[PDB]
Amino acid sequence: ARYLGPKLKLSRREGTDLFLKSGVRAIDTKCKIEQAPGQHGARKPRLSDYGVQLREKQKVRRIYGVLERQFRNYYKEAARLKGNTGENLLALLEGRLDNVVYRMGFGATRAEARQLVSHKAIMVNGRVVNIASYQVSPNDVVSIREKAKKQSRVKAALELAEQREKPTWLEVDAGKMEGTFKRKPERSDLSADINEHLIVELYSK
Amino acid sequence: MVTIRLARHGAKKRPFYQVVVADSRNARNGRFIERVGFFNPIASEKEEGTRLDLDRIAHWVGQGATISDRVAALIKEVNKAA
Amino acid sequence: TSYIGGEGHNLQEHSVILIRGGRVKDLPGVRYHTVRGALDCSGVKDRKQARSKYGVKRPKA
Amino acid sequence: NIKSAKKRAIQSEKARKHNASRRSMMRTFIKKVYAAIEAGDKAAAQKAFNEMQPIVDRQAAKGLIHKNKAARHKANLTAQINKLA
Amino acid sequence: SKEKFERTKPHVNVGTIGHVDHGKTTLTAAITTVLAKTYGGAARAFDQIDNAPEEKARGITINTSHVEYDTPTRHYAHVDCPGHADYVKNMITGAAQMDGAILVVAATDGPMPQTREHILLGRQVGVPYIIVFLNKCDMVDDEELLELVEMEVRELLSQYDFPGDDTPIVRGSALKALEGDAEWEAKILELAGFLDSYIPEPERAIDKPFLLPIEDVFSISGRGTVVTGRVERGIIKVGEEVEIVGIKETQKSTCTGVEMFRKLLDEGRAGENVGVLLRGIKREEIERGQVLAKPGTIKPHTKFESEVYILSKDEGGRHTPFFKGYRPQFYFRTTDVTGTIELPEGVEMVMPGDNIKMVVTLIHPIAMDDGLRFAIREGGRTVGAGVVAKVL
RNA sequence: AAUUGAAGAGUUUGAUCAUGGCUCAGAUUGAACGCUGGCGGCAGGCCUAACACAUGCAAGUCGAACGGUAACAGGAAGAAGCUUGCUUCUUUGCUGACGAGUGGCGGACGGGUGAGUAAUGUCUGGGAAACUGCCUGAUGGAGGGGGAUAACUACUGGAAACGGUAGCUAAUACCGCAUAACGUCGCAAGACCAAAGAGGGGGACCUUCGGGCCUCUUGCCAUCGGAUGUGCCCAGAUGGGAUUAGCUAGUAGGUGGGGUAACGGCUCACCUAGGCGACGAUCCCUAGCUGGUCUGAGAGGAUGACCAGCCACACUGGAACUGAGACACGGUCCAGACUCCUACGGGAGGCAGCAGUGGGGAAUAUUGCACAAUGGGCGCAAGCCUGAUGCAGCCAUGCCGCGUGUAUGAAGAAGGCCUUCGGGUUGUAAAGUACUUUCAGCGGGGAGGAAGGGAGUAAAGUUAAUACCUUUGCUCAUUGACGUUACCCGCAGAAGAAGCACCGGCUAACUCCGUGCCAGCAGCCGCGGUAAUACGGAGGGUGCAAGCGUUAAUCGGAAUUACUGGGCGUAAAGCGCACGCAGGCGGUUUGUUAAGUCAGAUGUGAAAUCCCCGGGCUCAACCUGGGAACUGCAUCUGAUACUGGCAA
RNA sequence: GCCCGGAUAGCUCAGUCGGUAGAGCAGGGGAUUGAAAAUCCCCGUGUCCUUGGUUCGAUUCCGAGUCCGGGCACCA
Ligand SMILES: Nc1nc2c(ncn2[C@@H]2O[C@H](COP(=O)(O)OP(=O)(O)CP(=O)(O)O)[C@@H](O)[C@H]2O)c(=O)[nH]1
């Protein structure tokens, strides 16, 4: 399911920062970034149109950690929704629980956030949830059970988001590893640089 | 011979029962005249638990619908006053 | 008539095999192949890359 | 086949013997009428008709004749005798 | 399935060994005949035990026929083996199951080199007991000749470690007892009571990991495939998974049927000699010689070093020495495998009657263990006899 | 709120634009094969031989219908040993019950397969010459007798299968008599037509001491209904070939007779000479059909396994019987073929029921558990039967969910690889280190699916009755195949859990070594005849993921069959030309019709499946509430511009 | 389980009925042609499938297995 491999090599391929190895230190800087996706990173590519359509597809998946069969189903749901597909797809990719937990400091890295949901530590409205792909409905909450509370990892990892931006569509309490969710994200509110446009063209064919 | 019985639909270990009006000679899920209400046996306590469109059911009783005691148990469950 | 793939086979006039579709476009009138990994027409000798085709198993050693 | 439901077989056999007998006696009185109508015996055909009336209707009441078939046997045959007489 | 087996008496494996035309099959019909006149149900005849057109035409045995009975002492299993030179392979398959062999000796000929091979193969398969029944006793009166015949049987067994001087040689007539004689039946009943005295109930180790020698395969029309063999070690019951281990690429199946000659036994413990049902296995894949084991505890061992007592022309082996590269047959009681004779530096060619040890590489892998006594046959003559010392 | 919906590329030629085929990128599948392999959830699993099949089970029930009782547990009289009432135990259908038999009911249901069938079938919508066990409403009856037979005995045939002969006895079995009506026939008159009783309780009365007698429950008979299913008719629709153009003579229709529940050539007798056919009749080949499923922007194309409806079939062909209903899967008879048993005369069997076997094949499962839930049969009921069904097993077969770990770690090592031997890469990757513990594995807790029912209990209807039966609450003991459950807890420890395809262009992603048009590659154009980003290996990288690929098959791309939406001067193609029937189309005006057309309404379009908004499994797939839709058809009422009809 | 025919130079195969392994093509060279093919000329490169003997010497005669193709028998 998971990539479970060298999660910085992905950032060197896409060229963009993905916060995969976000953890404790701010910026990576020790991987000879942008010029070495592999053994022949010296080759300035042609990067054709099919490539620019596909590189966009992989990048978004590489950020949230989704698989093709799973990611395509998110596109299938995005088409039937009202409004605009390019926006609702970014809504579903954001509505993932491990993505929600990532926006709360819990799980300094998106992978760790997936593990935290994996080990029954994450709970919504008094209901334990193991599925990291749990679709979060608007106006909910989040917290941590008494068992795996402040287990030496939640503390250190929570410090990271304290230095980050801490977006609008949600609110953290941090009194007992406490959180609370609100309305669903807007396109202008999320990521601020992505171009989902290329993705819609890819799944058309 | 008309009769009012259940249907047993849903999934494995999560039953459901379309209380229906059918001919007794059919199968459990076979040919029927009309489904009238339903029943969910796993409906402990929530917004929706059981529905029986009583008025149309009683119409078939005058016709000669032999109600099975299981269904009759539900009629005794969703009583005129209870 | 079916083309036998791989570098080296082990057939002897009877050897029961399995046929799979596909043309060769190199031999006149050949519209089939022989499955390398199925019956008697076994796997090709020492192939690492792409061993699903050519029927080599995973090397224990 | 050897089955405990073999009784239905032998019972149908036993029922057939009673059925072959009763159905045959009914038909003779009907055939008795046709022997009369061809002769022109307007009274005898009436005699044969009135004689076979209680026996043909009895078969209809005993779950053998479909109580409409027997009625039809009365009707058309009556239509013949009053046409002759 | 008919008539589920009822656990009443402890099981015993027995049967005939010996020279051609010596009434082994007639004795088999005669033994249970006297026992049919004592207890239970049996007494099959000449027409029943012999099954093939080839057999009842020239009075021979081509397939090892089996018969069952039980005295008021134990439960028994009789194994009727042939005695012809080219059918020695068959009697060895019968030798793999018998807890106690029984030598059938005609009063006329007596101890033969062919009878010598039926005895020698008994020690090399693990059987320690042989009760010798002298058949055709009603044909001899000249005892001085017959007493010299009986003592030659004992010392030949004594030559091959069977305590023959301690062995009660049973004398009697099988012909009359099979037809209903009250006189020679007790002569047959001699071996019967001695069967309850000389051959007891051995060490039935039912608490070991399951392993079973493949005797032959009998595909049941309507049920599926039934392999045959006595339980070497361990226990089986319907609802236990096993494997198909040996010669070919090893596969798996499930124990779903055990019959003690039509008698349905739920749990076939160690020593129980029956037919075992296989699930989803064809006639072709499984074969004579492999073994059924516990799910993955017996790997396909290929090579082993063995201590082999090389015989001479006087002891049944070759008459001329043979070099490095000899390719004989190796009887692993049911597993006939050809192997390489890897000679140690010191023995260039194997003289008739050597005390040596060589390393053998099998052409078909099989379950192997240190201490496995196996005889060596080639050209009709059992050319050698060894016991596994080292497994490579 | 209820379809927000359409991508191209490669390849002719020196080069271009066209025309134009071939091929590919995607989604999908009852999938098969190679490789690898952790769990779970929900579905699927003989599309090949409608080939043949051992064994077990798949359809039985009612003593509250009857004669009886062969058994098992009591009661009774008696017998025996001896603990003289502790035991043994012969008689005995007298209770509880129940084999074998008579009889009622079910066996026509449900489950399985798609051989046949191109229209006797199916779907849609109307229609009348129909029938309807069981359920139920209303109206009434429910009198009185007779003769048999099985079971059971005796003899007897046959190896058995299976009978035969003479007597015994019963009924809710059979059969008259009687009695009949808004029932049948008929113009009416008149004539004629039915049957079944049992069981519980009980004060008084009556006891030839069976019981009569009263009440209650259920059933029986007749009739009209309702409801339900089934049968039939008509219209349209319902594959390819015209290199099949004519076919048919009980055939087309009529008059009379018969037959069916029912109209009818369904079947006869005679008369008439017609009836069908280019808007494809016959004939051949193929094929179950439909709601649907797959693809598609749609229109369509293909297909129609699972769920469901309808039809046909049940070893091959044929017929009939009983029955409300079959021309009948575990029914009969006959012929045949193939197995099986035989005392050789003569018989028995039918897995296209669940499992399983052989065999066919590329390929598809366990000789599992329970009747707990639901449903069906029977029964007053409890219960008895249930391979329907509910589960479980097996297979990655599909779909969906999750894990196989996280943070940190620059000596930026080793080993490998490339090298301009400068170094880069492998690579924060690993080691080490600090944390974590989902699912497995082991030891403990623990829902829900269960409603009823049974006994007792109190009250209430009914009744002469605090009796019996019905109904409503209460209590006790309980009913779970799954099941070592869903879920929860603890435990130890990164601990058991990553492969597969590809890297010339198409199409995401590269170098080196080795083989030299050899070995080989391949979907398309092609590469390799010493320097290969294309072959084989190594390193790295790319895609996908418990799956990855290849093959087969459907659609798409294919506007390369063009209705939406193509062409014909030369690209493939205007008949050589004209006449002209069927057929199609048609100037202008007024009036009318309202057939086509348009609107609105109602009936219907089965449910589920697809779609919109929600609910419930930790979520999801899945199940599910309501709605929309089901693009259609029929009928009625209006509009009547336009087209057609009619009249001038 | 039993009974047959076969394993021969790289390939395709003849020869035995105890005498020291052959043929076609192959591969290479020469002659040759504007080039090629072809033709003629020269040779086994063999554990006669493996293994033991009877023997002066075994492809051979046999006894036995290993593999391949084909046929038949027994049915826990
Ligand atoms: N006089 C006598 N003759 C006897 C006796 N027992 C057997 N015979 C005969 O001996 C002969 C061998 O019978 P068989 O049973 O075939 O022997 P086998 O042991 O199977 C032989 P093969 O070795 O070929 O299979 C038959 O003729 C049998 O009747 C006995 O006690 N006395």
Side-chain angles (χ1 to χ4, degrees), chain E residues 247-290:
Chain E
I247 300 173
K248 66 175 182 62
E249 288 235 330
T250 60
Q251 80 181 316
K252 307 180 187 185
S253 177
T254 304
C255 312
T256 54
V258 176
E259 235 176 63
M260 186 54 229
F261 296 147
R262 296 186 180 70
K263 289 190 257 67
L264 290 164
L265 176 64
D266 305 302
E267 199 194 298
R269 59 99 185 81
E272 184 61 8
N273 196 357
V274 292
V276 171
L277 174 59
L278 276 183
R279 194 175 70 199
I281 309 299
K282 292 195 68 171
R283 172 67 198 184
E284 286 186 31
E285 306 177 308
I286 181 67
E287 81 264 50
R288 183 168 167 291
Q290 292 206 304

Side-chain angles (χ1 to χ4, degrees), chain A residues 8 10 22 52 56 69 83 95 122 126 140-141 148 162 167 186 194:
Chain A
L8 184 56
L10 304 176
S22 51
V52 295
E56 186 62 59
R69 179 49 62 75
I122 311 301
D140 283 309
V141 293
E162 301 302 301
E186 174 61 57
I194 53 171

Side-chain angles (χ1 to χ4, degrees), chain C residues 1-2 15 18-19 29 32-33 36 41 45 50 55 57 59:
Chain C
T1 170
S2 63
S15 59
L18 192 61
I19 304 297
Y32 300 106
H33 295 75
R36 306 316 303 289
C41 189
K45 185 188 69 178
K57 284 188 177 298

